[PDB]
Amino acid sequence: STIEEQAKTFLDKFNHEAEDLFYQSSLASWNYNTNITEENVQNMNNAGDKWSAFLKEQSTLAQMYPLQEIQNLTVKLQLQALQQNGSSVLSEDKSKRLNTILNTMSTIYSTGKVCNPDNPQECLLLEPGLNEIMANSLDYNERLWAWESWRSEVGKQLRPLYEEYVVLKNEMARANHYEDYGDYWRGDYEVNGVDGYDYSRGQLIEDVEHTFEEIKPLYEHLHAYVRAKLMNAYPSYISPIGCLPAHLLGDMWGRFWTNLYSLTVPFGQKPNIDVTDAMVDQAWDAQRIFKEAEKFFVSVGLPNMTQGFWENSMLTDPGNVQKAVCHPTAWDLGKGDFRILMCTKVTMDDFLTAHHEMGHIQYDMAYAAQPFLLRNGANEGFHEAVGEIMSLSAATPKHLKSIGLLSPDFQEDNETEINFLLKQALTIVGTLPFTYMLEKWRWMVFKGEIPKDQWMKKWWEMKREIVGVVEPVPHDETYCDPASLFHVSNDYSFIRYYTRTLYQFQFQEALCQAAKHEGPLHKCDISNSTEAGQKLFNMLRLGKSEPWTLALENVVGAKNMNVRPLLNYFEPLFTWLKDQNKNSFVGWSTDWSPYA
Amino acid sequence: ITNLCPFGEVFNATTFASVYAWNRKRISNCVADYSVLYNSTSFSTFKCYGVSPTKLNDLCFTNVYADSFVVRGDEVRQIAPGQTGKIADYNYKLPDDFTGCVIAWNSNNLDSKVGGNYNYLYRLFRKSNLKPFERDISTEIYQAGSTPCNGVEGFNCYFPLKSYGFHPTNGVGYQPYRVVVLSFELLNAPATVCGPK
Ligand SMILES: *[C@@H]1O[C@H](CO)[C@@H](O[C@@H]2O[C@H](CO)[C@@H](O)[C@H](O)[C@H]2NC(C)=O)[C@H](O)[C@H]1NC(C)=O
Ligand SMILES: *[C@@H]1O[C@H](CO)[C@@H](O)[C@H](O)[C@H]1NC(C)=O
Ligand SMILES: *[C@@H]1O[C@H](CO)[C@@H](O)[C@H](O)[C@H]1NC(C)=O
Ligand SMILES: *[C@@H]1O[C@H](CO)[C@@H](O)[C@H](O)[C@H]1NC(C)=O
Ligand SMILES: *[C@@H]1O[C@H](CO)[C@@H](O)[C@H](O)[C@H]1NC(C)=O
Ligand SMILES: *[C@@H]1O[C@H](CO)[C@@H](O)[C@H](O)[C@H]1NC(C)=O
Ligand SMILES: *[C@@H]1O[C@H](CO)[C@@H](O)[C@H](O)[C@H]1NC(C)=O
Ligand SMILES: [Cl-]
Ligand SMILES: [Cl-]
Ligand SMILES: [Zn+2]
Numbered sequence: 001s002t003i004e005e006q007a008k009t010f011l012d013k014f015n016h017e018a019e020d021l022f023y024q025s026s027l028a029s030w031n032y033n034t035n036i037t038e039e040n041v042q043n044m045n046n047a048g049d050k051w052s053a054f055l056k057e058q059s060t061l062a063q064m065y066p067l068q069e070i071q072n073l074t075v076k077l078q079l080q081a082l083q084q085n086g087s088s089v090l091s092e093d094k095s096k097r098l099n100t101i102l103n104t105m106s107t108i109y110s111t112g113k114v115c116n117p118d119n120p121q122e123c124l125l126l127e128p129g130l131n132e133i134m135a136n137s138l139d140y141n142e143r144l145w146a147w148e149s150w151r152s153e154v155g156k157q158l159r160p161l162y163e164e165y166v167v168l169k170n171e172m173a174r175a176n177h178y179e180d181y182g183d184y185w186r187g188d189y190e191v192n193g194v195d196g197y198d199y200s201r202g203q204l205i206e207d208v209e210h211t212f213e214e215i216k217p218l219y220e221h222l223h224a225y226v227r228a229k230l231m232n233a234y235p236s237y238i239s240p241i242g243c244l245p246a247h248l249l250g251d252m253w254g255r256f257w258t259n260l261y262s263l264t265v266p267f268g269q270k271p272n273i274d275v276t277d278a279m280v281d282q283a284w285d286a287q288r289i290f291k292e293a294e295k296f297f298v299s300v301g302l303p304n305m306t307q308g309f310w311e312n313s314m315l316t317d318p319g320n321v322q323k324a325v326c327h328p329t330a331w332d333l334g335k336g337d338f339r340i341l342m343c344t345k346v347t348m349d350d351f352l353t354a355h356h357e358m359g360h361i362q363y364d365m366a367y368a369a370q371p372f373l374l375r376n377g378a379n380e381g382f383h384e385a386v387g388e389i390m391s392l393s394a395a396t397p398k399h400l401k402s403i404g405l406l407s408p409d410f411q412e413d414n415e416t417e418i419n420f421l422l423k424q425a426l427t428i429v430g431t432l433p434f435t436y437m438l439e440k441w442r443w444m445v446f447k448g449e450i451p452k453d454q455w456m457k458k459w460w461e462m463k464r465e466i467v468g469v470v471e472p473v474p475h476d477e478t479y480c481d482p483a484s485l486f487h488v489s490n491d492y493s494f495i496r497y498y499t500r501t502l503y504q505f506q507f508q509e510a511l512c513q514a515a516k517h518e519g520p521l522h523k524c525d526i527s528n529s530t531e532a533g534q535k536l537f538n539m540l541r542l543g544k545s546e547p548w549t550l551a552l553e554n555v556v557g558a559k560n561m562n563v564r565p566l567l568n569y570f571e572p573l574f575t576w577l578k579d580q581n582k583n584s585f586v587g588w589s590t591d592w593s594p595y596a
Numbered sequence: 597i598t599n600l601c602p603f604g605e606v607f608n609a610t611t612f613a614s615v616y617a618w619n620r621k622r623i624s625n626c627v628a629d630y631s632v633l634y635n636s637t638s639f640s641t642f643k644c645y646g647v648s649p650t651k652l653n654d655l656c657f658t659n660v661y662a663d664s665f666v667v668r669g670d671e672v673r674q675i676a677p678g679q680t681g682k683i684a685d686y687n688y689k690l691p692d693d694f695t696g697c698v699i700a701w702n703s704n705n706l707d708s709k710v711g712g713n714y715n716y717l718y719r720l721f722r723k724s725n726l727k728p729f730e731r732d733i734s735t736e737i738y739q740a741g742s743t744p745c746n747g748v749e750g751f752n753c754y755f756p757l758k759s760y761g762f763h764p765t766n767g768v769g770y771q772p773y774r775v776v777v778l779s780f781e782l783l784n785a786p787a788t789v790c791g792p793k
Contacts, residue, residue, distance in 0.1 A: 001742045006752055009721065009740040013754055016720060020712070020761035027765070061751065312765055336767015 003069040010065065011078055014058055015372045019334060022372075025051040026333035033341060034314050036111055036323040041103050048099070056088040074545060078373040089175040090168070098168040101161050105489040110325040112154040116145070126150060126252065127326040127343060128317065134252045135259045140237055147247035148473050151481050158483035163452060165491075166445060173446075182446035185493040188380050191547040197559060199549055205443070207561055208498060212436050214563045218570055219433055221577035222425050223468050224586045226257065229264040241585050242592030243470035246463070250426070253485050254469055257430035258349055261423050266576075267415035273397055273423060275405035276348045282404070286315040286344035292403060293354045296394055300526060300533030302362055309338050309361070317343035327486045328353050330360035332375070338364055352391045352427075359387020367543030378539075378548035381499030381561075386540065388504040389511065393525045395424065402527065412523070421522055421573035428501055429570065437466040439495040441482060453477050461590075468588040474595055505565035506556040511535060521569045601626035601789065606662045607634045607699075612707070612774050614717040615665040615687040616757060617733045623660035625788045629653070634776075639702035639768075645677060646695035647780060655780070656787035663688070663729075663777040666707055666716045668760065670769035672700050675777065686719040690777070691728035700775040707772035708762040716760040716772065 028047035032040040062082040070076045088095065114130070115123035124130055124146075133146040169181040178184040186201040223244070230248060231238045237245065250259030261274055279289075294305050318324055326343035333339065338361045344350045363386045367375055377383035393399055397420060400406045410416075441459055444450045450458050456475050459482060463469045475481065483489045505521075511532040512524035526532040539555050549559045556562075567574070601623050613619040630653050634640065642649060667675070667683055674684040677694040684690075690698075707713055721738040734756075737745040741752025749755050762772045 006740050009738075009754070010752075012720065013758075016758050020759075023761070023763070024712070027763075064751070306767060308765060308767060333765075335761070335763070335770040337765050338767075 003065055004072055004075065007065045007070060007075050007079055010061065011075065011371070014082070018054065018372055021051050021054050023334040023337070026331065026337070030331065030333065030339065033325040034318070034322065036107055036325070045096070045099055045103070052086065052088045055086055059083060059085050074371070077545060078371055081373045085176065087172050090172055094168055094171070098165070098172070101165050101168070102491055105158055105161050105165070105483065106325065108154060108157055109486060109489045111323045112157070114149040114153045128345070130252060134247070135250060138233060140234055143247040144472055147252065150252065151475070151479055151484050155480050155484045156478050158489055159478060159480035162480055162483045170446060180446040180448070182443040185495070188493070189548065191549055194547050194550065197547050197549040204495070208436060208495065211502060211561060211563045212432070214567070215432055218567060218574050219429055220586050221574065221581055222429055223588065224581045224584045225577050226260060226264055228584050233263050237594055239592045241589045243464050243468045243588045243590070245472050245594055246469050247472050249469070254467070255431055255434050255485070257426040258423070260426055264422065264426070266418045266422055270415045270419055271407060271410055273400070273406070273416070273420050274348055275351070275400055278405045279346050279348065279351065284346050289344060289351050289354045290315060290358070293358050296355065296390060296527065297358065297362055299528045301530040302533055302537065303365065305361065306336065306338055309340070312337065313339045314341050315344050328357050330357045330364070332364040336368065352395060355391045355394050356387035359390055362386065363540050366537060366540035369541070370543040370545060374543045374545045376544045378544050378546070378551045379499070380493055380496035381503050382548060384496050385500040385503040385507065388500060389507045389536070392504065392508050393527060396420070396523065396525050398523070398525045399527050417522070417572060418576055421570060424522070425570055425573055432498060432501055433467045435494055435498040437462050438482065439498070442488070442494070456481065464590040470593050472594050499561055502561050502563060502566055503552070505569050506552070506558060506562055507536070509565045510556045520572065521565070522572070597625060599626045601628040603628060603633055603662070606664055607776055609664070612664055612666045615667050615683060616717055616719040618663050618665040618688055618731060621662050623662060623789055627792060628660070628789055629792060634699060634701055637701060641672065641700045642697065643676065644697040647697065649697060652780070653791040654793045656790040657780045658783040658785050658787055659781050660789045661779040664775065666703070666772050666774055668769065669702070669771050669773050672773050672775065675700070675775055682720060683718065685725040686722040687726070689726040689728050689730060696777060696779040698775065698777050700773050702771060703774045704764060704771040707774070708764045708766065710764060713762040714759040716762065717757045718760060719756055720758045721754055721756045
């Protein structure tokens with residue numbers, strides 16, 4: 001009869017009705033991401049519309065219970081989360097048009113193929129066809145072709161769609177009392193009503209920029225070392241003061257420099273820590289990759305993967321029969337259904353990616369006991385970080401010895417630490433400027449600070465300045481090179497991966513301390529440490545019923561994002577790079593370009 | 597005496613009843629073989645309270661009552677004495693002094709279909725908890741607010757019966773489970789339900 005008791009009863013009906021409607025939407029969305037047909041786009045929009053319409057009518061009803069008369073905190077949190085009036089504040093035509101744009105860009109990304117100028121019937125998809133080139137080719141022209149033809153044939157198709165995509169997303173955000181769609185994304189870190197832990201949406205930009213300044217020294221020395229090692233592989237193409245060519249980094253966009261290890265190994269005569277050759281030699285498959293990652297989470301006390309996980313997940317490319325979205329993603333479909341979608345290859349990069357995506361599923365299964373409105377991450381950074389604090393230990397040579405990917409008589413010396421730390425820096429440190437620059441471009445595009453004609457002008461002006469990467473071919477406004485990346489054409493936020501990197505070392509510092517590890521942080525292996533898994537599980541089970549600032553302090557002792565654990569992890573490599581760069585230039589010129 | 601108890605029609609019926617309308621069948625004047633009731637599988641549970649299941653094949657009772665219904669996997673733990681929840685409070689309630697057995701097994705291959713099987717229902721709201729072995733099949737609008745409902749499903753006025761969504765790809769906790777509750781009673785009358793012995 002009281003307002004609080006009416007709210008508990010109202011939430012009870014919401015939880016039991018949203019459980020099935022959200023699951024039907026997840027099922028229809030899965031049938032499209034694995035099987036891209038026009039029929040599956042229809043059913044995906046149908047189950048999605050019935051979920052958005054259910055949220056709107058329930059959000060409207062939720063606003064009739066005033067929070068000022070709710071003494072219960074968890075009830076106040078659920079109502080507060082439900083009263084946010086969603087992406088259904090657009091008209092019916094604009095909502096169906098916006099979803100059509102999103103559906104069109106997603107199909108173009110995962111099904112768009114480029115054909116070499118020689119053969120008009122032999123074409124290559126981005127996966128596995130251009131990803132194999134950008135990762136294993138050492139020819140300057142072969143990499144220049146795949147990098148440019150992907151951004152000229154497929155990237156130009158996304159340009160008119162993305163322009164309209166920005167307009168409709170801003171209308172949806174401005175109808176939500178947000179200043180732009182970029183401010184809407186920054187709302188995931190927002191915390192209100194908690195004394196001593198409140199975090200504003202604008203505070204994120206300050207903390208991201210302030211923390212980035214403390215990362216530049218480590219990146220600039222890693223940049224100079226890679227540039228020097230790249231000159232020995234591409235002699236007549238790279239300047240010792242110029243930026244790096246975008247098509248010579250490990251992947252299509254330069255997101256990770258992981259594939260540049262074989263060209264930048266400090267001590268190549270030492271046993272190679274890249275286990276890719278060992279995995280193929282021992283005849284590993286995608287089943288073995290995930291079973292080993294499954295075994296790692298169990299060693300720390302976390303549960304096995306569900307029986308439905310092994311039956312419903314898609315762990316390999318289904319072939320040419322059905323077109324699929326091969327980008328590694330994890331799925332919390334609801335009703336205890338957990339799946340992973342990944343076109344896994346037999347490489348170490350996919351071995352650590354399996355630990356990343358399984359970290360999502362492990363996090364999803366943890367807070368499954370929470371109420372429906374609180375089954376989410378503390379913030380987007382926490383979610384993508386869980387799998388990475390496991391990759392820190394799974395990549396160490398100690399753990400690789402136990403699973404049998406390194407020789408049993410492997411040793412830990414002067415030059416295996418630098419080999420390992422260099423590889424870890426290519427993956428972890430390399431993506432920090434790439435992530436910050438990419439999200440700052442979208443933040444300014446959504447805010448209106450970048451007009452449509454300079455989109456590609458300001459895009460590469462920031463690539464040269466912030467990331468130290470230069471374009472091999474000059475691009476005009478017909479190109480949409482941000483949209484050539486998965487997270488941009490599939491409507492995901494990217495700053496989650498910047499906070500992920502800084503969070504994962506704050507967590508690792510606390511888990512290694514619970515495991516009573518003695519020594520440097522990079523030699524810590526939390527394998528078979530239930531004390532470490534328990535300290536992590538106690539935070540995963542809370543969902544987002546507690547603010548991310550308070551949830552972070554309860555584990556690491558800091559209310560905010562911090563860089564000290566990140567630099568402490570790479571300090572042995574940082575002093576080694578400063579000595580290896582005495583005969584090199586630390587920095588880059590924002591004017592040099594490999595073209596005229 | 598000589599006839600056989602029809603436990604097959606209880607455990608192996610084609611379709612079970614919703615938990616809010618649970619079915620009860622009285623077993624009398626027959627010989628029962630409790631070693632053959634159901635298919636024991638990896639997920640089946642056999643929980644007895646106050647009676648040894650390894651011995652009731654040598655036991656006699658006045659009457660036996662078999663209550664059968666379908667419940668979510670997460671809620672099978674609620675068919676015990678001294679339990680709470682939406683099922684134990686509103687749909688089916690065993691007394692704190694319970695002397696019987698609760699047999700349950702996974703039925704995801706029978707009660708779940710590709711579109712979702714919404715034929716099993718459960719009561720979500722009730723103005724009071726159920727007394728032990730009480731059944732409530734009333735469809736009456738639940739009054740959550742202070743204003744009356746008068747049979748109108750508007751606001752703070754909810755329909756009391758919700759539907760189970762049984763999909764074959766559901767998690768184990770959201771999969772259908774068939775449950776049979778056996779009650780063994782002893783009265784001043786002669787026993788009529790014995791085992792082979
Ligand atoms: C605030 O709300 C939740 C939800 O009602 C409360 O959790 C309840 O706790 C009591 C006993 O622990 C149970 O009888 C309820 O049934 C619980 N909830 C549910 C959904 O069953 C919580 O205790 C409330 N009180 C406070 C002070 O926060
Ligand atoms: C993919 O979807 C089509 C209909 O759009 C269907 O006929 C086909 O069977 C599906 N493929 C698989 C492997 O399920
Ligand atoms: C998890 O499943 C694997 C299957 O390979 C099994 O070997 C292991 O014993 C299981 N773990 C537990 C704790 O049951
Ligand atoms: C290798 O060890 C020697 C001493 O044994 C030391 O002088 C040198 O700096 C070390 N090199 C590296 C790269 O750690
Ligand atoms: C961890 O434990 C498993 C079995 O419990 C064992 O096979 C493995 O070798 C252990 N690894 C380490 C690094 O101790
Ligand atoms: C019910 O069927 C199962 C197998 O489906 C069988 O083992 C069991 O004996 C049957 N029940 C009875 C009472 O016969
Ligand atoms: C009884 O259960 C097991 C597991 O499903 C199976 O081997 C057997 O066929 C079942 N029997 C029948 C008749 O359903
Ligand atoms: Cl139990
Ligand atoms: Cl419950
Ligand atoms: Zn990812």
